[PDB]
Write a protein that binds this ligand. Structure first.
Ligand code: ZN
Ligand code: ZN
Ligand code: ZN
Ligand code: ZN
Lengths: 206, 206, 206, 206
């Protein structure tokens, strides 16, 4: 649990997140909780050129390491960590199906029992706000109060969990749910969903 | 036909089922018939970390190996084996197109002559029921009485055959049929299908 | 131009045709013209298990090599070779977008200038007929009289050219055209196409 | 910055452009600015057979290297270089989603903040014109006056930037935007877009 181990995993998560086709416009950003702030992917360096010595450390004040620029979308990583104390890893990306549902400005409702992996009966879509600003972070923070993933209108996805492995898995899982909403949405509207009672049983079960 | 050979193939089938993109939410489960019960993939271990010593053995009583937890979706593997005596391998997954057709609650009708690979003129969709419960298994069992694959509403697919190779092939084939239903369903409804007489000739031919 | 070189290329074309995702239900069949008949992929053996000693030779009488079963869909390979004397390689497959357009029973019209790669202003769809029968071959033969690729209703695609390389390329190219018809067909109908005059200029140009 | 280094990168860009699935009908063409003209991929040789000694040099007069045929779609590479003095690399391709939007003859509007990567609030679609002719080049030149990528009706995409890396990245990014337009276009029309004011803030920000 040395800095460098965490820096390798973030790099492995970038490489695996690209494997699954979740990191397409090279929009992916990965962060882990560390010390009193986080370890995050920097700006500029496309994943395959990424070395442990590239990962930037940002403190709880928001001050960063001298000589390294943090990702350009870093402050909502900090908002997610502050709003959800249990999160230890954050995943961001412009995966195409999530973003497609985020352009229609819709929540993804309980069309499948795995919807409960993010804490409830949906995956909400937070309102649009210029990237990198504080107003964007307020939206993310409000949205993650009772869910672990959220779409961000006209933009993409933020997923958070106990570690990188689950966070990656949750982001991947939201994409599949996304895709399923869009494919069935083209045929019928609304889409058949599981009732709130059914979703409370599944939640208990997990 | 030692335990360990069967444990490698299940592992190869997991790895190949991921190759084809049939195992996406890491929802895949593979089982083979063995002795008086089956050999199945356990819960927790994502496929690439899977070793022969991970495969769990569940007997016909439903009792499992001490110290190993069976997949969380194991009892409908047992229902499929009991309902279809000829099955020797079972494949389960949340492949995206199958699941998309399962959210609309529809059967996939004879839109293509390969529909006959699953025993008849369609691929039925069994009604929804909380995962892992006995009511879910009753649906699966009723659904596999005269077909070898079935969708499961709001959930995914169960495919069964004489061995792993064909079972994998059948599941893969149902996904392609699925995808074809959805792509043409967006354009026209209903979709043109082959008549029952045409499908009886193809069945005879196989 | 020994038998064995031709048997390797057919095998390479199977392996590459799978690379591009054109051979999905393991429906692919490849044939080359040889001597007074052809060299074709046999029945049973999935591509990766395929060895040079698997390729079957069928003569112009339709008699095959003792001890080897030809593909189950071999006689329309023979019809394509007889109808189009210039063809030296034939490619068949159930690629998903081609087959999707073949289930709607539609021709793919000149929506893109590459449509001219198959000889004219469209890719026709031959009427349905039980696989492997002579009535199916009559359709294929009529359809390839003035085109090099044809969809086959409720089934897939046959593409033919001067060698394996181009045949593979033509089949691949028809899939992309297919996909483009389906994606734009979901939005508008009819789809904008290039005029017959524009298509005669492009034909001259190739 | 020797000829040969530039010839390797063009070849690497072809190989990577195929990795991402941007070069499907083997329609891809890559060019870099060099001396008083450019270095471009030749006609005939499919990418994997491509060697440094294949790259053709075309001068500002349009005269080419003796014994090597330039790509068949080379003159709009020259139009892009002349119209956009800052471009040092050009990417062309028939990527399927771009081409799908180009068959409907539509611009891709600001449905996502990354639309600003190409200089403004859209990605325009230049009118159709027989490939390889001068009238086609006039369209491209007019279209790139104030944008860095343009669709070309009934055909595909041209993207241009400071180097190969960014050009490749921009083309890739237009495909994702394309795909997003098409997926949401099937559900609703028109599609929600970001206002011109929002897009002026994002532009300033980049
Ligand atoms: Zn972002
Ligand atoms: Zn399941
Ligand atoms: Zn066939
Ligand atoms: Zn072109």
């Amino acid at each position: 649990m040395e800095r460098n181990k965490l820096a390798r995993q973030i790099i492995d998560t970038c490489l695996e997140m690209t494997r699954l086709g979740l990191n397409q416009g090279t929009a992916g950003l990965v962060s882990v909780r560390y010390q009193d702030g986080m370890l995050i992917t920097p700006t500029g360096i496309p994943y395959e050129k990424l070395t442990e010595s590239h990962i930037v450390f940002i403190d709880g004040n928001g001050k960063h390491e001298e000589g390294k620029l943090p990702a350009s979308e870093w402050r909502f990583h900090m908002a997610a960590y502050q709003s959800r104390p249990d999160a230890n890893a954050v995943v961001h990306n412009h995966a195409v199906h999530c973003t497609a549902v985020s352009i229609l400005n819709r929540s993804i409702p309980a069309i499948h029992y795995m919807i409960a992996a993010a804490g409830g009966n949906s995956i909400p879509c937070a309102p649009y706000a210029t990237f990198g600003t504080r107003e964007l972070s307020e939206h993310v923070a409000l949205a993650l109060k009772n869910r672990k993933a959220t779409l961000l209108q006209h933009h993409g996805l933020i997923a958070c969990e106990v570690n990188l492995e689950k966070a990656l898995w949750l982001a991947h899982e939201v994409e599949v749910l996304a895709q399923l909403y869009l494919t069935t949405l083209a045929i019928t509207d609304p889409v058949p969903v599981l009732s709130d009672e059914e979703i409370a049983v599944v939640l208990e079960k997990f």
